Write an enzyme that holds these catalytic residues in place. Structure first.
Site, PDB file in Angstrom:
ATOM      1  N   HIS A   1       0.800  -1.219   0.000  1.00  0.00           N
ATOM      2  CA  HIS A   1       0.000   0.000   0.000  1.00  0.00           C
ATOM      3  C   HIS A   1       0.842   1.282   0.000  1.00  0.00           C
ATOM      4  O   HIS A   1       0.270   2.367  -0.038  1.00  0.00           O
ATOM      5  CB  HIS A   1      -0.984  -0.015   1.172  1.00  0.00           C
ATOM      6  CG  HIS A   1      -0.372   0.195   2.516  1.00  0.00           C
ATOM      7  ND1 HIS A   1      -0.184  -0.839   3.410  1.00  0.00           N
ATOM      8  CD2 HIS A   1      -0.019   1.329   3.168  1.00  0.00           C
ATOM      9  CE1 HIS A   1       0.328  -0.352   4.531  1.00  0.00           C
ATOM     10  NE2 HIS A   1       0.430   0.960   4.413  1.00  0.00           N
TER      11      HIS A   1
ATOM     12  N   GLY B   1       3.111   5.997  10.083  1.00  0.00           N
ATOM     13  CA  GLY B   1       4.473   5.915   9.595  1.00  0.00           C
ATOM     14  C   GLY B   1       5.194   4.636   9.941  1.00  0.00           C
ATOM     15  O   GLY B   1       6.303   4.418   9.441  1.00  0.00           O
TER      16      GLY B   1
ATOM     17  N   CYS C   1       4.429   1.483   9.280  1.00  0.00           N
ATOM     18  CA  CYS C   1       4.296   0.313   8.429  1.00  0.00           C
ATOM     19  C   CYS C   1       5.643  -0.072   7.831  1.00  0.00           C
ATOM     20  O   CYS C   1       6.510   0.766   7.601  1.00  0.00           O
ATOM     21  CB  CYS C   1       3.257   0.543   7.349  1.00  0.00           C
ATOM     22  SG  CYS C   1       1.546   0.366   8.023  1.00  0.00           S
TER      23      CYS C   1
END
Lengths: 302, 304
Positions: free
Chosen positions: B44, B146, B148
């Site tokens: 993503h 932030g 991920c």
């Protein structure tokens, strides 16, 4: 349901690069290699024979540079000088550590969190975070061979070294030295029973935890009732608490949740008696192991 | 030893700190994992916030070139020379092999197992903690915007086993992510929609481990001669929100050391589940299932 608070440690890489094994005669424990210095606990000098009232003066005089062997497992280094500072040895080796981080030495106060890198035989094996207890012990995880493991905080990318592990106490808790050579809690680096003082609750951390609760919406314990600082501090001397002392970090919490310290000091006086059927963040007891800084960083990201 | 000697212990994170990088695509930015000539990151990163629910990953991938991905190390820029999707992850190829890649494997973890998490923001590691993969395939972490691409891992000898790459937070505040084969733990989807996790359960084998830690600390008031077999316990477990108990060599070492049999503790769990009736076990008033048999063997008995 889940608050987003975990026991959070600093990344340990900068400190892993400094751990070595220190050996003297037949003891072997861990040391910290910074520049041209290797720090380790002075009881490396002592045979298992005679670990109570050791004569450290006579042990040191007894020593030479060939006495100490420093191995780097995680190169081998030549000791070319040795001195004793309080309960620590300061060994001078011939090579400088090329991977010495920017660092300072600091002494942690009750209530403050620091990270620990537990090591055996110079090999780092785990990391965890503790709070220095008000009786100058920590609730750690240390086994035979862990001495020389170090604890530290971080300001920016600077490492602030604050602890080197020395011993385990009667009740299972632990203590060590600051890098000025002094033992937290005045404990003796001798293998004899020693009186731990009674623990107390870390008030500012309890306050930080209740603010954490409020930020997660769990705020039932919040009444408009307020309690002053100097009074709460009056109450705490008789009820196994430590003085409350605001900090900018606590203040940030008061402001994002618009719940003033003093409502919470009042809440603690009620809650010390019982949650009275209710839960706070899944606990029935007050929690004093999270700092205002922990809560700001984990829940709000400062 | 009123203190148990038990703490939440992570692996030393140095090995993994040297593999973290920042990956950016358009304006979404997160963390990636640089192993040899590959960089792993959540797919993503390809997605614009507008299109972040119901995104077309098979098409977003098509719309990319190798220049669409900027990869940077702080703890240099790297040149991406190939790109590919694998489940919910991207596998980028870069033209420099990470000179500090550890020995590693990719192993999916099962419920009850513990792993270490290196929380990272903008490719900079900021903290480490340990979690148990819950039976509902969530973890109880600390992650913010932030985070991920933060990774979870175990160590076995020299070998890091990477087992988790962080993807999302759920309604109840827990978290989930992908294994490095690209699948998501729990079947959750890398779409920004409210998803409801299954019911959580007690990790039976960990509760046993923890009762052995109690005995090793001298806290054994709950041990009786009475015993429940693994089969009977597992039947009872299905009805009482407990996982199936499965024994291991690590549990067995605890049983040898203490002289207390697994089946005595399964009986004790059946009793303690309904309340401790005023007593405490290692300062707790409820059953603790976040310590593994391996945890207890290592921390209390120095065994690996």
């Amino acid at each position: 349901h889940h608050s987003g608070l975990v026991k959070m440690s600093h990344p340990s890489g900068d400190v892993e690069a400094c751990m070595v094994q220190v050996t003297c005669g037949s003891m072997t424990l861990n040391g910290l290699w910074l520049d041209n210095t290797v720090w380790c606990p002075r009881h490396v000098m002592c045979p298992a024979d005679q670990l109570s009232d050791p004569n450290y003066d006579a042990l040191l005089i007894s020593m030479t540079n060939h006495s100490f062997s420093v191995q780097k497992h995680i190169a081998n280094l030549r000791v070319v000088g040795h001195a004793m500072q309080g309960t620590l040895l300061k060994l001078t080796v011939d090579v400088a550590n090329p991977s010495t981080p920017a660092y300072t030495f600091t002494t942690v106060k009750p209530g403050a969190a620091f990270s620990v890198l537990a090591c055996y035989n110079g090999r780092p094996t785990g990391t965890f975070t503790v709070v220095m207890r008000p009786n100058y012990t920590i609730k750690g995880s240390f086994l035979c061979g862990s001495c020389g493991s170090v604890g530290y905080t971080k300001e920016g990318s600077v490492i602030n070294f604050c602890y080197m592990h020395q011993m385990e106490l009667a009740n299972g808790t632990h203590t060590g030295s600051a890098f000025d050579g002094t033992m937290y809690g005045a404990f003796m680096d001798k293998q004899v029973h020693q009186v731990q003082l009674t623990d107390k609750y870390c008030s500012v951390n309890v306050v930080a935890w209740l603010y954490a609760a409020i930020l997660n919406g769990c705020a039932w314990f919040v009444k408009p009732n307020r309690t002053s600082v100097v009074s709460f501090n009056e109450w705490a001397l008789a009820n196994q608490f430590t003085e409350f002392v605001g900090t900018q970090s606590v203040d940030m919490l008061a402001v994002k949740t618009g719940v003033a310290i003093e409502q919470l000091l009042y809440a603690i006086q009620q809650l010390y008696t019982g949650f009275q059927g209710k839960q706070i963040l899944g606990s029935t007891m007050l929690e004093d192991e999270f700092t205002p800084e922990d809560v700001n960083m984990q829940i709000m990201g400062v």
